[PDB]
Amino acid sequence: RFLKVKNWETDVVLTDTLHLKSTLETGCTEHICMGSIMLPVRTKDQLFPLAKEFLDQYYSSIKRFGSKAHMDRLEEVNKEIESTSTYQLKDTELIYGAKHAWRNASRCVGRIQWSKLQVFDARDCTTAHGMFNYICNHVKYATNKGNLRSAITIFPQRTDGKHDFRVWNSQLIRYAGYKQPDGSTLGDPANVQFTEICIQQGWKAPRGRFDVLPLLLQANGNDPELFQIPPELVLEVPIRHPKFDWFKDLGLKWYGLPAVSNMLLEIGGLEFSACPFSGWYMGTEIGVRDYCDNSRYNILEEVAKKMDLDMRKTSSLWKDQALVEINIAVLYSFQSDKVTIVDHHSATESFIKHMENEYRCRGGCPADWVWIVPPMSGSITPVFHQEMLNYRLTPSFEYQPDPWNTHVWKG
Amino acid sequence: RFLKVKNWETDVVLTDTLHLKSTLETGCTEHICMGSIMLPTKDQLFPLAKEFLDQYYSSIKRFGSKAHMDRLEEVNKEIESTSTYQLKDTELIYGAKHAWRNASRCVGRIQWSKLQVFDARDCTTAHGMFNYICNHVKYATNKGNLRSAITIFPQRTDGKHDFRVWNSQLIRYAGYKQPDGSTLGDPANVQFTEICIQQGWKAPRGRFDVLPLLLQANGNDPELFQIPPELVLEVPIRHPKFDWFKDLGLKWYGLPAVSNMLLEIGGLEFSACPFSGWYMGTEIGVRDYCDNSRYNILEEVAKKMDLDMRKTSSLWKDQALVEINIAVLYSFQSDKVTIVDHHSATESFIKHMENEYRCRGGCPADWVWIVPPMSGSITPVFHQEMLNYRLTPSFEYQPDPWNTHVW
Ligand code: HEM
Ligand code: HEM
Ligand SMILES: CN(C)Cc1cccc(OCc2ccc3ccc(N)nc3c2)c1
Ligand SMILES: CN(C)Cc1cccc(OCc2ccc3ccc(N)nc3c2)c1
Ligand SMILES: C[C@H](O)[C@H](O)[C@H]1CNc2nc(N)[nH]c(=O)c2N1
Ligand SMILES: C[C@H](O)[C@H](O)[C@H]1CNc2nc(N)[nH]c(=O)c2N1
Ligand SMILES: [Zn+2]
């Protein structure tokens, strides 16, 4: 069965066969679409088919399908599962899996860069302190003095689900949020709950508006431990506007390395519950979501006041106006400091090319339109008018419950 | 089976049951989501009629009454006899209001119960259709104080006697492919501005030329009619800041009147059913003015603003796009022509959404279409999970007549 998507701006039609190789479920049925829902201990019984499916893909990509190396590997993995109820990936397999998980991320606009992922293998790690050391080396390598490089560090896989490695932070670098007695929040509102835990775990909070959160790391199912990232390793960027001089006086800065640390890497049925990865920012991630979301720093108001906007009627589009200037500042500041960043026009443009190429060479590209389209200026980027098919391929990145909800405290 | 949706900006959770009454299909499967795709007999007819009549009579607190059971019987007979059937006026009004209420892609549904329905089922000719359409346009416009309306022409019979309005909206601007190879006027309507000539329109080959109506009645060849200009209310577009804005020579019409959809009620098919409301500002300013495949005036507007159009990262398209939209809203409001901004509309939609969850058990909604084409995440709908499903009565797409019409 074939499927076609159409770009309504350019009339380009593409044909999808890759969706046939789709395993997981979307959430949708013939009767209902869950396309806008944010979120839609494994037995040997169900592990070997997963392992085979992965190994077959892998040996196909290297053009050794049905070879002796391929067959011997199947058998080696077979014997290891029935003997140990799990298996270990070669370095070759691990790198491949990590890159492909990224490649299969239907919600990712940055996938053009997927082949260039730096993979650090942290599967020999046994402690939190070890975890800290690995993460530090990730942060330094990825940051590269502002010249950002995509990387992922991969800690040991889940075994019986009772010995999990987890990074408790949602991103390796993020600012504290503190709820005040009056109800106002100091810092980043998204991180209030997490900041509380850290403080309770013994963090001494500087209690400013831009405090870098400490790392909270869990090894082999043990209680998590606090570590402070060396500040010389945390690249931060002061935010100024190229025309508005009072902008600097807003006192804003952001960090340069976006590094998501709370997802789950599934490769060949194996589960990697700590797999922090990093790229670089699309400007609107900071400029629209981080600053101007109502449930974040929410500086639309103050930026608007200082612009002397008519904030009386909403039909004056004072929010829209201010939002654009803030995004202008973000790109400006980052580029001035020679810290890698991409604008949403450039990023979405690059994605359409990636997507077309993926259709030609791979037979499809799963994409989630709800997430690919940027959170401002939607229709003036080319992804808006691009039809997309969504489906799930493995290897993949998955969500997981927050660790403070599932963890069994030792003491 | 009892689904929940969360708003991630407000933590509010609504539960959906209404989806369980869904009849049609989505395009999607358990293996693949098509959410972003634009377009996904006697024994057929009675169950359809019954389903409608059941929900109709339930809505007036007379489910299983004499009237209800009598009516089911009555319609059963007419179907068995005539192979089709006719709606009572009450049912027709209820059906139209509900086709709108069920339009999952429509952000403006808070107004759904206040629809004026004009029954034009007694119409026989293109000249007839023209008269009814002029009356619709005058009523709806209401000297700028816009009122929602729909005009309903006779239902399909055997697909050979179809009434169709060939225009995609009752009011739209002409577009002509030039020897220069570019495009004057509105590029969306180049093919249609052509067909108007193939049937003999005398195009004043200009820019904002109001297209003539091309009406087909009872399956006959369509005929051209020119809407009286005094019935077409227009708004000159000026910026409340940039005096040079007026120089761009821009205007738009106030009445958005969609005329190419198919209204389905209780199994019956109304292929000519032009309906109208009022614009959300971004429909004109973001899409009509700035789409690459439309008036595409971004380049020009940014130039008069003297923005650095050298690098995409200056966000000059963004800055200009906003100004353009400010003007549109400003012009309409200053001319006392009804319009709504995307902030207000989306806010009203969350309210409507909450009402529908409360008094109906839900609200089918297509996020890809509800979220405005600019400033997405600064409107409340961006953070609103929605469920999409197909309820009936409904408005459906239908092929362009020229691709179909037996000539
Ligand atoms: C290198 C530059 C990159 C850019 C510019 C980029 C951009 C983005 C953006 C804007 C989103 C949407 C996030 C949101 O608004 O919530 C996203 C999502 C995502 N990215 Fe990329 N990304 C990059 C690299 C990466 C890398 C290196 C990986 C994995 C190794 C990755 C995996 C993902 C995944 C799995 C999601 C979806 C998150 C979710 O499902 O909640 N991205 N990306
Ligand atoms: C009165 C104020 C109204 C507002 C503000 C409004 C707004 C909108 C908007 C913004 C869209 C998105 C379409 C696009 O961007 O191209 C839309 C679609 C739609 N509207 Fe409403 N509308 C209104 C009245 C009506 C009425 C009176 C009807 C029918 C009786 C209606 C039926 C529909 C339908 C069926 C769609 C989706 C059509 C499609 O699938 O393309 N709307 N509306
Ligand atoms: C706190 N979590 C539950 C929410 C969450 C967890 C993980 C990922 C996520 O999506 C945002 C995201 C993920 C990966 C990215 C990679 C590069 C980049 N520039 N931005 C990203 C942005 C959102
Ligand atoms: C040529 N066709 C693709 C145009 C077309 C056909 C069918 C539906 C359609 O949807 C746009 C639409 C529909 C109804 C509306 C009602 C009020 C309003 N302000 N805008 C609307 C906008 C647009
Ligand atoms: C490809 C995609 O389905 C298409 O561009 C859709 C996206 N969302 C839209 N949303 C609205 N309101 N109107 C549209 O025409 C579209 N077009
Ligand atoms: C309700 C919806 O699922 C949710 O708000 C989504 C919408 N689209 C998004 N798109 C991106 N890139 N990031 C997001 O967090 C979201 N949030
Ligand atoms: Zn779907």
Coordinates of C-alpha atoms in Angstrom, one line a residue, chain A residues 7-366:
Chain A
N7 CA 2.8 20.4 -0.5
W8 CA 0.0 22.9 -1.1
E9 CA 2.4 25.8 -1.7
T10 CA 4.5 24.0 -4.3
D11 CA 2.2 21.2 -5.5
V12 CA 5.0 18.7 -4.9
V13 CA 3.6 15.2 -4.3
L14 CA 5.7 12.5 -2.5
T15 CA 5.0 8.8 -1.9
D16 CA 5.3 6.9 1.3
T17 CA 6.1 3.2 1.6
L18 CA 8.2 3.4 4.7
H19 CA 5.0 3.4 6.9
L20 CA 4.6 -0.3 6.1
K21 CA 7.7 -1.0 8.2
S22 CA 5.8 0.6 11.1
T23 CA 5.4 -1.4 14.3
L24 CA 4.2 0.8 17.2
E25 CA 0.8 2.4 17.5
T26 CA -0.1 6.1 17.1
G27 CA -3.1 6.5 19.4
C28 CA -5.4 7.1 16.5
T29 CA -8.2 4.9 15.1
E30 CA -10.4 5.1 12.0
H31 CA -12.9 6.8 14.3
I32 CA -10.7 9.2 16.2
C33 CA -7.6 11.3 15.8
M34 CA -5.3 11.8 18.8
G35 CA -2.9 13.9 16.7
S36 CA -2.8 16.7 19.3
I37 CA -2.5 14.6 22.4
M38 CA 0.9 15.3 24.0
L39 CA 1.5 11.8 25.5
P40 CA -0.4 9.1 23.6
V41 CA 10.5 -5.6 33.0
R42 CA 10.4 -6.9 29.4
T43 CA 10.0 -10.7 28.8
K44 CA 12.3 -13.0 26.7
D45 CA 8.9 -14.1 25.4
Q46 CA 8.8 -10.7 23.5
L47 CA 12.4 -9.8 23.2
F48 CA 13.9 -12.0 20.4
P49 CA 11.6 -10.8 17.6
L50 CA 12.5 -7.3 18.6
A51 CA 16.1 -8.1 18.6
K52 CA 15.9 -9.9 15.2
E53 CA 13.9 -7.0 13.6
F54 CA 16.6 -4.6 14.8
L55 CA 19.5 -6.8 13.7
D56 CA 18.0 -7.3 10.3
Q57 CA 17.7 -3.5 9.8
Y58 CA 21.3 -3.0 11.0
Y59 CA 22.7 -5.6 8.7
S60 CA 20.7 -4.2 5.8
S61 CA 22.1 -0.7 6.3
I62 CA 25.6 -2.0 6.1
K63 CA 24.6 -4.2 3.1
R64 CA 25.3 -7.5 4.8
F65 CA 21.8 -8.9 5.0
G66 CA 21.7 -12.7 5.1
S67 CA 25.6 -12.8 5.4
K68 CA 27.4 -15.1 7.7
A69 CA 28.2 -12.1 10.0
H70 CA 24.5 -11.4 10.1
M71 CA 23.4 -15.0 10.9
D72 CA 26.1 -15.6 13.5
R73 CA 25.1 -12.4 15.3
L74 CA 21.4 -13.5 15.3
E75 CA 22.5 -16.8 16.8
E76 CA 24.8 -15.1 19.3
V77 CA 22.0 -12.8 20.5
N78 CA 19.6 -15.7 20.5
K79 CA 21.8 -17.7 22.9
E80 CA 22.5 -14.7 25.1
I81 CA 18.8 -13.9 25.6
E82 CA 17.7 -17.5 26.5
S83 CA 20.8 -17.7 28.8
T84 CA 20.6 -14.3 30.4
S85 CA 17.1 -13.0 29.5
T86 CA 18.7 -9.9 27.7
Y87 CA 21.6 -9.0 25.5
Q88 CA 24.4 -6.5 24.8
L89 CA 24.7 -4.4 21.7
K90 CA 28.1 -4.1 19.9
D91 CA 29.4 -0.5 19.6
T92 CA 28.5 -0.6 16.0
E93 CA 24.9 -1.5 16.8
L94 CA 24.7 1.1 19.5
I95 CA 25.8 4.0 17.4
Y96 CA 23.5 2.9 14.6
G97 CA 20.6 2.7 17.0
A98 CA 21.2 6.1 18.5
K99 CA 21.4 7.8 15.2
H100 CA 18.3 6.1 14.0
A101 CA 16.2 6.9 17.1
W102 CA 17.0 10.5 16.2
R103 CA 16.1 9.9 12.6
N104 CA 12.8 8.4 13.6
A105 CA 11.8 11.3 15.9
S106 CA 8.7 12.4 14.0
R107 CA 8.4 15.5 16.3
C108 CA 12.0 16.7 15.4
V109 CA 12.5 19.5 12.9
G110 CA 16.3 19.3 13.3
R111 CA 16.6 15.8 11.7
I112 CA 18.7 16.9 8.7
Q113 CA 21.7 16.5 11.1
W114 CA 20.9 13.0 12.1
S115 CA 23.9 11.2 10.6
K116 CA 26.4 13.5 12.5
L117 CA 25.6 12.4 16.1
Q118 CA 28.5 12.0 18.4
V119 CA 27.8 8.9 20.5
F120 CA 29.5 8.5 23.9
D121 CA 29.1 4.9 25.2
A122 CA 28.7 5.1 29.0
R123 CA 27.6 1.5 29.4
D124 CA 30.6 0.7 31.7
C125 CA 29.3 3.3 34.3
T126 CA 28.4 2.0 37.8
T127 CA 27.9 5.1 40.0
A128 CA 26.4 8.6 40.1
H129 CA 29.8 10.1 40.4
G130 CA 30.7 8.2 37.3
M131 CA 27.5 9.6 35.8
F132 CA 28.5 13.2 36.7
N133 CA 32.0 12.7 35.1
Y134 CA 30.4 11.4 31.9
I135 CA 27.9 14.2 31.7
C136 CA 30.6 16.8 32.3
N137 CA 32.6 15.4 29.3
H138 CA 29.4 15.5 27.2
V139 CA 28.7 19.1 28.1
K140 CA 32.2 20.2 27.3
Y141 CA 32.5 18.3 24.1
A142 CA 29.0 19.4 22.9
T143 CA 29.4 23.0 23.8
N144 CA 32.8 23.3 22.1
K145 CA 33.2 27.0 23.1
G146 CA 30.0 28.0 21.4
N147 CA 30.5 25.9 18.2
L148 CA 27.9 23.3 19.2
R149 CA 28.1 19.6 18.2
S150 CA 25.2 17.1 18.5
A151 CA 26.0 14.4 21.1
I152 CA 24.3 11.6 23.2
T153 CA 25.8 9.8 26.2
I154 CA 24.4 6.3 26.8
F155 CA 24.3 4.8 30.2
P156 CA 23.6 1.1 31.0
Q157 CA 20.3 -0.4 29.9
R158 CA 17.4 -1.5 32.2
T159 CA 17.6 -5.0 33.5
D160 CA 14.8 -6.0 35.9
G161 CA 13.6 -2.4 36.1
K162 CA 14.7 -2.2 39.7
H163 CA 18.3 -1.2 38.9
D164 CA 17.5 1.8 36.6
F165 CA 20.0 4.5 35.6
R166 CA 18.2 7.8 35.5
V167 CA 19.0 11.5 35.0
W168 CA 16.3 13.2 37.1
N169 CA 16.7 16.6 35.4
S170 CA 14.6 17.1 32.3
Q171 CA 17.6 18.9 30.7
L172 CA 21.2 18.8 31.9
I173 CA 21.2 22.5 32.0
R174 CA 18.1 24.4 33.3
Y175 CA 17.3 27.3 35.6
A176 CA 15.6 27.0 39.1
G177 CA 12.1 28.2 39.8
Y178 CA 11.0 29.1 43.3
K179 CA 7.3 29.7 44.3
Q180 CA 7.1 32.6 46.8
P181 CA 4.6 32.8 49.7
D182 CA 2.6 35.5 47.7
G183 CA 2.1 33.2 44.8
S184 CA 4.6 34.7 42.4
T185 CA 7.5 32.6 41.0
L186 CA 11.1 33.6 41.0
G187 CA 13.0 32.0 38.1
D188 CA 11.7 29.5 35.7
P189 CA 8.1 28.3 36.5
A190 CA 8.5 25.1 34.6
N191 CA 11.2 23.9 37.1
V192 CA 9.5 24.7 40.4
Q193 CA 8.7 21.1 41.3
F194 CA 12.1 20.0 40.3
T195 CA 13.8 22.8 42.3
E196 CA 11.9 21.8 45.4
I197 CA 13.2 18.2 45.2
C198 CA 16.7 19.4 44.7
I199 CA 16.5 21.7 47.7
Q200 CA 15.0 18.9 49.7
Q201 CA 17.8 16.6 48.6
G202 CA 20.1 19.2 50.2
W203 CA 20.8 21.7 47.5
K204 CA 21.6 25.1 48.9
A205 CA 19.7 27.4 46.6
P206 CA 21.2 30.8 45.6
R207 CA 17.5 31.8 45.0
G208 CA 18.2 34.1 42.1
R209 CA 16.2 34.4 38.8
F210 CA 18.8 32.4 36.8
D211 CA 20.4 29.7 38.9
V212 CA 21.7 26.7 37.1
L213 CA 20.1 23.6 38.6
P214 CA 22.4 20.9 40.0
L215 CA 22.4 17.5 38.5
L216 CA 20.4 14.8 40.2
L217 CA 21.7 11.4 39.1
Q218 CA 20.6 7.9 39.8
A219 CA 22.8 4.8 39.1
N220 CA 21.8 1.1 39.2
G221 CA 18.5 1.9 40.9
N222 CA 20.0 3.6 43.9
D223 CA 18.9 6.9 45.5
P224 CA 19.9 9.9 43.4
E225 CA 22.8 12.2 44.3
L226 CA 23.4 15.9 43.8
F227 CA 26.3 17.3 41.8
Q228 CA 27.0 20.9 40.7
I229 CA 28.1 21.3 37.1
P230 CA 31.3 23.3 36.9
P231 CA 30.2 26.8 35.9
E232 CA 33.1 27.2 33.5
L233 CA 31.4 24.4 31.6
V234 CA 28.0 26.2 31.4
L235 CA 27.9 28.6 28.4
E236 CA 25.4 31.3 29.0
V237 CA 24.3 34.2 26.7
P238 CA 23.2 37.7 27.8
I239 CA 20.1 38.8 25.9
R240 CA 20.1 42.1 24.1
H241 CA 18.1 43.7 21.3
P242 CA 20.0 45.1 18.2
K243 CA 17.9 48.3 18.3
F244 CA 16.3 48.5 21.8
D245 CA 18.9 49.5 24.4
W246 CA 16.6 49.0 27.4
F247 CA 16.4 45.3 26.5
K248 CA 19.7 44.5 28.2
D249 CA 18.2 46.1 31.4
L250 CA 15.5 43.4 31.4
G251 CA 18.3 41.3 32.9
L252 CA 17.8 38.2 30.8
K253 CA 20.2 35.4 29.8
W254 CA 19.8 31.9 28.5
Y255 CA 22.1 28.9 28.3
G256 CA 23.5 27.7 25.0
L257 CA 23.2 23.9 25.2
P258 CA 19.8 22.4 25.0
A259 CA 20.3 18.9 26.3
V260 CA 17.2 16.7 27.0
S261 CA 17.9 14.1 29.6
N262 CA 14.6 12.5 30.5
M263 CA 13.7 10.4 27.5
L264 CA 14.0 6.7 26.9
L265 CA 16.1 5.2 24.1
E266 CA 14.6 1.9 22.7
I267 CA 17.0 -0.2 20.5
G268 CA 16.1 -3.7 19.5
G269 CA 13.9 -4.2 22.6
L270 CA 16.6 -2.9 24.9
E271 CA 15.7 0.1 27.1
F272 CA 18.2 2.9 27.9
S273 CA 16.5 4.9 30.6
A274 CA 19.3 7.4 30.9
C275 CA 20.5 8.7 27.6
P276 CA 21.0 12.5 27.7
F277 CA 21.3 14.1 24.3
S278 CA 22.0 17.6 23.0
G279 CA 21.8 19.6 19.8
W280 CA 21.5 23.4 19.4
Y281 CA 18.5 25.7 19.8
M282 CA 16.0 26.9 17.3
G283 CA 15.5 30.5 18.4
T284 CA 11.7 30.2 19.1
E285 CA 12.4 27.5 21.7
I286 CA 13.8 30.3 23.9
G287 CA 12.2 33.4 22.3
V288 CA 8.6 32.1 22.1
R289 CA 8.2 29.2 24.5
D290 CA 10.8 29.8 27.3
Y291 CA 10.2 33.6 27.6
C292 CA 6.7 34.2 26.4
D293 CA 4.6 31.2 27.4
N294 CA 2.1 32.3 30.0
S295 CA 3.4 29.5 32.3
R296 CA 7.1 30.5 31.9
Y297 CA 9.1 33.8 32.4
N298 CA 6.2 35.6 30.8
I299 CA 7.9 38.8 29.9
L300 CA 5.6 39.8 27.1
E301 CA 4.0 42.3 29.5
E302 CA 7.2 44.1 30.4
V303 CA 8.6 44.0 26.9
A304 CA 5.3 45.4 25.7
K305 CA 5.3 48.2 28.3
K306 CA 8.8 49.3 27.4
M307 CA 7.8 49.4 23.7
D308 CA 4.9 51.7 24.6
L309 CA 2.4 49.4 23.0
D310 CA -1.3 49.8 23.1
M311 CA -1.9 47.0 25.6
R312 CA -5.6 48.0 26.1
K313 CA -7.2 46.1 23.2
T314 CA -5.8 42.7 22.4
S315 CA -6.7 43.6 18.8
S316 CA -3.7 45.9 18.8
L317 CA -1.6 42.7 18.5
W318 CA 0.7 44.0 21.2
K319 CA 1.5 40.5 22.2
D320 CA 2.4 39.5 18.6
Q321 CA 4.6 42.6 18.3
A322 CA 6.5 42.1 21.5
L323 CA 6.9 38.4 20.8
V324 CA 8.7 39.1 17.5
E325 CA 11.2 41.6 19.1
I326 CA 12.0 39.1 21.9
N327 CA 12.8 36.5 19.3
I328 CA 14.8 39.0 17.4
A329 CA 16.9 39.7 20.5
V330 CA 17.5 36.0 21.1
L331 CA 18.9 35.3 17.7
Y332 CA 20.9 38.5 17.8
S333 CA 22.5 37.8 21.2
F334 CA 23.4 34.2 20.3
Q335 CA 24.9 35.1 16.9
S336 CA 26.9 38.0 18.4
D337 CA 28.5 35.6 20.8
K338 CA 29.1 33.1 18.1
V339 CA 27.0 30.5 19.9
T340 CA 25.3 28.1 17.4
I341 CA 21.6 28.8 16.9
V342 CA 19.0 28.5 14.1
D343 CA 16.0 30.6 13.2
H344 CA 12.7 29.0 12.4
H345 CA 12.7 30.0 8.8
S346 CA 16.1 28.4 8.2
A347 CA 15.2 25.3 10.3
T348 CA 11.9 24.6 8.6
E349 CA 13.4 25.2 5.2
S350 CA 16.1 22.7 6.0
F351 CA 13.6 20.2 7.2
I352 CA 11.5 20.2 3.9
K353 CA 14.8 19.3 2.0
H354 CA 15.6 16.6 4.6
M355 CA 12.1 15.3 4.2
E356 CA 12.1 15.2 0.4
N357 CA 15.5 13.5 0.4
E358 CA 14.2 11.0 3.1
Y359 CA 11.2 10.1 0.8
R360 CA 13.6 9.5 -2.2
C361 CA 16.2 7.5 -0.4
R362 CA 14.3 5.9 2.4
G363 CA 10.7 5.8 1.1
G364 CA 9.3 8.1 3.8
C365 CA 9.8 10.4 6.7
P366 CA 7.5 10.2 9.7

